[PDB]
Nucleic acid binder design. Structure first.
Ligand code: T1C
Ligand code: MG
Ligand code: MG
Ligand code: MG
Ligand code: MG
Ligand code: MG
Ligand code: MG
Ligand code: MG
Ligand code: MG
Ligand code: MG
Ligand code: MG
Ligand code: MG
Ligand code: MG
Ligand code: MG
Ligand code: MG
Ligand code: MG
Ligand code: MG
Ligand code: MG
Ligand code: MG
Ligand code: MG
Ligand code: MG
Ligand code: MG
Ligand code: MG
Ligand code: MG
Ligand code: MG
Ligand code: MG
Ligand code: MG
Ligand code: MG
Ligand code: MG
Ligand code: MG
Ligand code: MG
Ligand code: MG
Ligand code: MG
Ligand code: MG
Ligand code: MG
Ligand code: MG
Ligand code: MG
Ligand code: MG
Ligand code: MG
Ligand code: MG
Ligand code: MG
Ligand code: MG
Ligand code: MG
Ligand code: MG
Ligand code: MG
Ligand code: MG
Ligand code: MG
Ligand code: MG
Ligand code: MG
Ligand code: MG
Ligand code: MG
Ligand code: MG
Ligand code: MG
Lengths: 92, 120, 157, 94, 100
RNA sequence: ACCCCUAUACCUUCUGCAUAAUGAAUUAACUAGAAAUAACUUUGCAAGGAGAGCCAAAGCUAAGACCCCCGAAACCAGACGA
RNA sequence: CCGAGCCUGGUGAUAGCUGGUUGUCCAAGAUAGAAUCUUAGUUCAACUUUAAAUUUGCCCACAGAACCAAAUCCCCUUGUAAAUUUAACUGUUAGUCCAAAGAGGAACAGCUCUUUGGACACUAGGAAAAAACCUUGUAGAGAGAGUAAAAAAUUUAACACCCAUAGUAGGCCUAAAAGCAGCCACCAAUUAAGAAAGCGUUCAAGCUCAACACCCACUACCUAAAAAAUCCCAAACAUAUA
RNA sequence: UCUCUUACUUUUAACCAGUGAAAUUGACCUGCCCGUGAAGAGGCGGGCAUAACACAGCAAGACGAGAAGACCCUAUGGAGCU
RNA sequence: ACCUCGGAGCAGAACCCAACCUCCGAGCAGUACAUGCUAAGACUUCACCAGUCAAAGCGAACCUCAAUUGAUCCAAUAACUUGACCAACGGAACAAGUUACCCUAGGGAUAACAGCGCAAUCCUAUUCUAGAGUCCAUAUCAACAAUAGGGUUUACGACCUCGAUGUUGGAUCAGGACAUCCCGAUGGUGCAGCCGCUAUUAAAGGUUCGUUUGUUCAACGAUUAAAGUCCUACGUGAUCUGAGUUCAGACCGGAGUAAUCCAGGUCGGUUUCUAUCUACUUUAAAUUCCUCCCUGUACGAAAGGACAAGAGAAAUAAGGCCUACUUCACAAAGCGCCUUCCCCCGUAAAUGAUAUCAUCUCAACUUAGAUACCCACACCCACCCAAGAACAGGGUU
């Protein structure tokens, strides 16, 4: 039922990113939370790594755009600074 | 003789009907691509194997984020037959430092910043 | 093998699959459009002539009559001055229908023949007909009165 | 009764293969995926001139780290504790 | 003498029609070493506009030309460089008129 | 225990061996990688090193660590045989 | 076992040739070429391995590379992480099919020879078995799950009816050429028939077709095989919502 | 000799008693058809067949055993002869 | 035949790129006499060797060409320099034939047999309708050409096998295909009849004996209903043969100086196997000719001359058996005798729709259209047997 699960946004494998795989398997009977599971720890580390790449590539591109802007304004500044320093004489 | 392939530039000139079929906005392009490898590099040229290694898609079905910049798109265009490109969508915005530990990518292609594992 | 062979070469299976996937698909109509919904002017002048002139018009079924017989009968009726007009039905019938001697309409079916003349010399016509037994004298109309075969005979004696 | 001359799938005379439906539905599916790739690579966020140097520092510094490792190869330290600990292979109780 | 697909081999004319010529021309065509059809100006034009009408009317989203020129699925690994211009209508010396 | 499902001995040789290519009945024993020039590693001492000889524009001294087995048809010398 | 006895010795003759080559476990790893009494081998190169030193290596963009096709070279970005050099060596140097461009041969070969790229000499799944085709690669345990490639479709040939006199045996041409051996013309009478499209006459004579009438209407799917040798080869099934 | 072969005796033979080899042998729980495949299958695929086990006979197969092809090619291998 | 060097194509655009692939050339000539000296940086024939270009400088002045070539040692010479069609051109200082009298090591890396691939050649079918057939393509035959098959030849390839897959014919026993030689059924005929020709269907049954050749084959003699075409490791040598062919001896002619050789002939010349496994070892329905009769009938001008229906008489095959002959003799045999039974499909017709006629109909439809064997079963020590290798079987009243 993978295509149906994708159509509902719930991955395609039921062992993927849902509560059925990401909730803790057990807990102590008194009610204490169990130590975190190893696969879930690995998944959370990999998700942090992904999210940190999303922030970087966005901010590297969002920095390159403003660098391109701040360069074209300097080029148009050195194109608009066109005051003739001496004054035309001669046949005028 | 078998060589590399120059793909005409028209293929990447998109149509308004293409926009309504795959809703994306020509003005305001999307910034980051979720690229997943969905075919092998075996039975394929060595240069296509080299690009899959460069793009970091050695494992199949493992998603990678890349820039929607002209240079990366050129490489993804030599391997477009062995991959799936989707736009990375950001509903609640870019992750923050206080939110970087509760993210999930989801099959819709939507990096959500708050994962709770609780019914709505 | 070379790229050009004397026989149709066996393709690679992916190329076979490509051909099968890129075959032509004709447009299919939704509700099947099958299920969805001359000389006659000259001939008109000639029929206007045989009806606005000769007072006697006689219809006879055009029995087979081998050439010599067709020709001979014609020369005898020519003697008593009678014309053998053979004019088509697909022009003749609707003209009768709107030019008012429409009671001759259920009579001009099958092969037919007009024996017309200004002179009502019906007796000679009769003598001929009876020499050839397999001819009917279907009917006709003298002095604008529709008459049967027996009426023709009466207005004959 | 029906033998293909030689090996079946190589040569001048092969055993004929035909395309089933699922084989065509599989090829059609991969075609739709590739067409959606053609669209999402048709709207570049940046232009080449706009991206001409936006990653130069990160790439240069990464290669400097690679050079740092490949330069910092050297033999490991040796220890008198590591040498004298071998004397414990004759540590008797009494 | 090398003959390719789409070349007229003989031409006839005069105070005659296509039926008259078509009889013995189809006989000769049949005995020719390649596929061959007796054609007129009208029938040749009708064939070409029939092929154009079929190409415009095709309801298949996937054409050989599109897939081959875009290297969709990496299909140039089983195609030939001449197939980029032949577009799946030619396979060696054989022309396939039913392909669009 | 069988029945059920899955599974084309091994070695050598080769582009490729279930091959109907080689070898093998099996058991026990016997039966096949020898060293230099350098290099590298680890000690010693160090503009010198080595228990004469030799090397030395950081070397020299010492050590460690690498080079198989069976098989012709022949050739020659001296004896022994009608 | 005499094309040159036998025995001992040199002798552990020699063998670019065959055969053989002994504990465990991990790892990297598949071959452009040139010489050669050489092509059954070797040496150098290339590729491969280890250890060191250093800095760029692959992918690539405008610009750019000659007169008489696919592509490449060059190449900043960029995405990546390799590269070169120094030191030390072995081994491989008898290659197969597939796709593509060619060449030779028969536009033969499971044929031969080059080139670009796969794959195989490594795993697993599929294509019946299966090297070389497709899916897929990095290894363990599981009586969990989502998938990838992945199952051949086709069945063809009915075609009218009814009618026909005649200028003339058009001329020429001929033995005669009478619609019809050949040539020229191709008018003409009847409601409507070619100085005749096919057949048939030595020539004639004949009977069809095109024309009248007639009438519902030309109904008009435009397509096409079969052969070998032990014994056919899964069993079957047109109809319950992809 | 053959058409066209038959009969008998002796040897061999088979059964009983005594004595007791040889080549050969990867392991075998060792079937038929079609197909496949290093291109000719007991062992692979699809089908079929099938309780177990002696004795006699046969020679179609196990590319049956024997002899590291006598032919052909190669080897910077021999030898005889001219 | 080739072996070294260069240009062009293959190899279209940086480089590179093979074939006993397609073409063309070279093994110099001419000039000069600074064609002296030296020296940065480069190229490079995929290695090395070798080869190539070159600024600046000193000294003067004010090379063309495409290849046009040859290492080391050694030799010559006072020296500078100079020596190979070393052309097998990265060159051994200097060495040919022959071997069937042969030997060894290997090779299925490589030929001969067979298999396999392939189908040029070979064979067949169809399409096309020139032409032949008096006329008339299509009774029959058939060009130019087209489309398909087949796998019998001759080849081509070199994929299994050279630590052996033994061979030509013949014998024996044959399994199979049908593309049918005969026997059956049918359609056409340029079919009067008898004969034929040709096509459809049919593989149950059958398909002779001799002279010469080693002979397959072929010719010839005599028959026959006919004397098929093929496949099966050119079926089958652990069943046989050995004439040929394929070792060592010899002869003739030829080749060579000779040794020796001939894809020419000729005489002679060792054919092993005791069977382990697989498989197999008794599955009763016969065909064909001839004679007489039909009948000198049908048919035909005559000459000639049928098919059905009926009766017999054989031959072969299969199975059995001794009465008599014969080999023989309590019996086995053939040379003797007895028995032997179904169909068979190509087509030809009737009724009748699609298509109110007609039409044999991939319309519904109608017609031509097996029995027999065998069958009960701890009397069994033993004896006998027409039963039998052993075992089993029958009889013993
Ligand atoms: C069997 N015969 C016909 C034969 C044939 C060939 N080869 C050919 O003729 C060629 N055949 C081919 C082409 C290879 C198929 C042969 O080559 C031979 C022989 C015979 C042998 C005899 C050998 C024998 N020994 C080994 C038992 C012997 O006793 C002697 C002897 N003189 O003492 C031999 O001669 C013998 O060794 C030998 O030479 C033979 C063959 O060479
Ligand atoms: Mg095969
Ligand atoms: Mg043709
Ligand atoms: Mg071993
Ligand atoms: Mg081999
Ligand atoms: Mg084999
Ligand atoms: Mg074996
Ligand atoms: Mg083999
Ligand atoms: Mg062998
Ligand atoms: Mg061997
Ligand atoms: Mg042992
Ligand atoms: Mg010597
Ligand atoms: Mg004496
Ligand atoms: Mg002796
Ligand atoms: Mg040795
Ligand atoms: Mg490894
Ligand atoms: Mg040499
Ligand atoms: Mg050499
Ligand atoms: Mg060698
Ligand atoms: Mg994995
Ligand atoms: Mg005994
Ligand atoms: Mg053995
Ligand atoms: Mg196999
Ligand atoms: Mg088999
Ligand atoms: Mg076996
Ligand atoms: Mg036995
Ligand atoms: Mg053997
Ligand atoms: Mg040997
Ligand atoms: Mg030998
Ligand atoms: Mg050699
Ligand atoms: Mg020698
Ligand atoms: Mg020697
Ligand atoms: Mg070089
Ligand atoms: Mg200068
Ligand atoms: Mg040489
Ligand atoms: Mg040389
Ligand atoms: Mg001799
Ligand atoms: Mg071979
Ligand atoms: Mg052969
Ligand atoms: Mg004719
Ligand atoms: Mg061939
Ligand atoms: Mg080869
Ligand atoms: Mg052999
Ligand atoms: Mg063997
Ligand atoms: Mg037949
Ligand atoms: Mg044989
Ligand atoms: Mg045998
Ligand atoms: Mg024998
Ligand atoms: Mg010998
Ligand atoms: Mg004798
Ligand atoms: Mg066996
Ligand atoms: Mg009779
Ligand atoms: Mg009827």
């Amino acid at each position: 039922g993978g295509q149906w699960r994708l159509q509902q946004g719930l991955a395609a494998n039921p062992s993927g990113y849902g509560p059925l795989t990401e909730l803790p398997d057990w807990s102590y009977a008194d009610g204490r939370p169990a130590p975190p599971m190893k696969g879930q720890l690995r998944r959370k580390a990999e998700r942090e790594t992904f999210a940190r790449r999303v922030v970087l590539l966005s901010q590297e591109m969002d920095a390159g755009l403003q660098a391109w802007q701040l360069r074209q304004q300097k080029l148009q500044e050195e194109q608009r600074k066109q005051e003739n320093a001496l004054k035309p004489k001669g046949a005028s | 003789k078998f060589t590399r392939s120059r793909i005409p530039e028209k293929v990447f000139q998109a149509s308004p009907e293409d926009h309504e079929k795959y809703g994306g906005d020509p003005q305001n392009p999307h910034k980051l691509h979720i690229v997943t490898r969905i075919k092998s590099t075996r039975r394929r040229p060595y240069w296509e194997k080299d690009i899959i290694k460069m793009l970091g898609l050695e494992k199949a079905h493992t998603p990678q984020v890349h820039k929607n910049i002209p240079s990366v798109n050129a490489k993804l265009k030599v391997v477009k037959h062995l991959i799936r490109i989707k736009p990375l969508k950001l509903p609640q915005g870019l992750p923050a430092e206080e939110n970087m530990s509760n993210t999930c990518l989801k099959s819709t292609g939507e990096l959500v910043v708050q994962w709770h594992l609780k019914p709505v | 093998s070379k790229a050009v062979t004397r026989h149709r070469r066996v393709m690679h299976f992916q190329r076979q699959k490509l051909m099968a996937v890129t075959e032509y698909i004709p447009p299919k109509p939704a509700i099947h459009p099958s299920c969805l919904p001359g000389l006659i002017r000259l001939l008109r002048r000639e029929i206007a002539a045989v009806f606005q002139d000769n007072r006697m018009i006689a219809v006879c079924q055009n029995v087979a009559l081998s050439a010599e017989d067709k020709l001979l009968m014609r020369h005898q009726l020519r003697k008593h001055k009678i014309l053998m007009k053979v004019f088509p039905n697909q022009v003749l019938k609707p003209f009768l229908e709107d030019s008012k001697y429409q009671n001759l309409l259920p009579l001009f079916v099958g092969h037919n023949m007009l024996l017309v003349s200004e002179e009502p010399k019906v007796k000679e016509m009769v003598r001929i007909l009876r020499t050839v037994p397999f001819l009917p004298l279907l009917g006709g109309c003298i002095d604008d009165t529709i008459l049967s075969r027996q009426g023709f005979i009466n207005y004959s004696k | 009764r029906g033998r293909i001359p030689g090996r079946q799938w190589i040569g001048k005379h092969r055993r004929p293969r035909f395309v089933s439906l699922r084989a065509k539905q599989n090829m059609i599916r991969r075609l739709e995926i590739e067409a959606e790739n053609h669209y999402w690579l048709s709207m570049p966020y940046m232009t080449r001139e706009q991206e001409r140097g936006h990653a130069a520092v990160r790439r240069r510094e990464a290669f400097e780290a690679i050079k740092a490792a490949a330069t910092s190869k050297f033999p490991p330290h040796r220890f008198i504790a590591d040498q004298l600990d071998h004397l414990n292979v004759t540590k008797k109780w009494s | 003498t090398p003959v390719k697909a789409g070349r007229l081999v003989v031409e006839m004319g005069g105070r005659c029609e296509f039926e008259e010529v078509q009889g013995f021309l189809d006989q000769v065509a049949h005995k020719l070493p390649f596929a061959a059809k007796a054609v007129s100006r009208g029938t040749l034009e009708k064939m070409r506009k029939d092929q154009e009408e079929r190409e415009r009317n095709n309801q298949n989203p996937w054409t050989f030309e599109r897939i081959a020129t875009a290297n969709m699925l990496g299909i140039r690994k089983v195609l030939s460089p001449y197939d980029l211009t032949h577009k799946g209508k030619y396979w060696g010396k054989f022309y396939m008129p039913k392909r669009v």
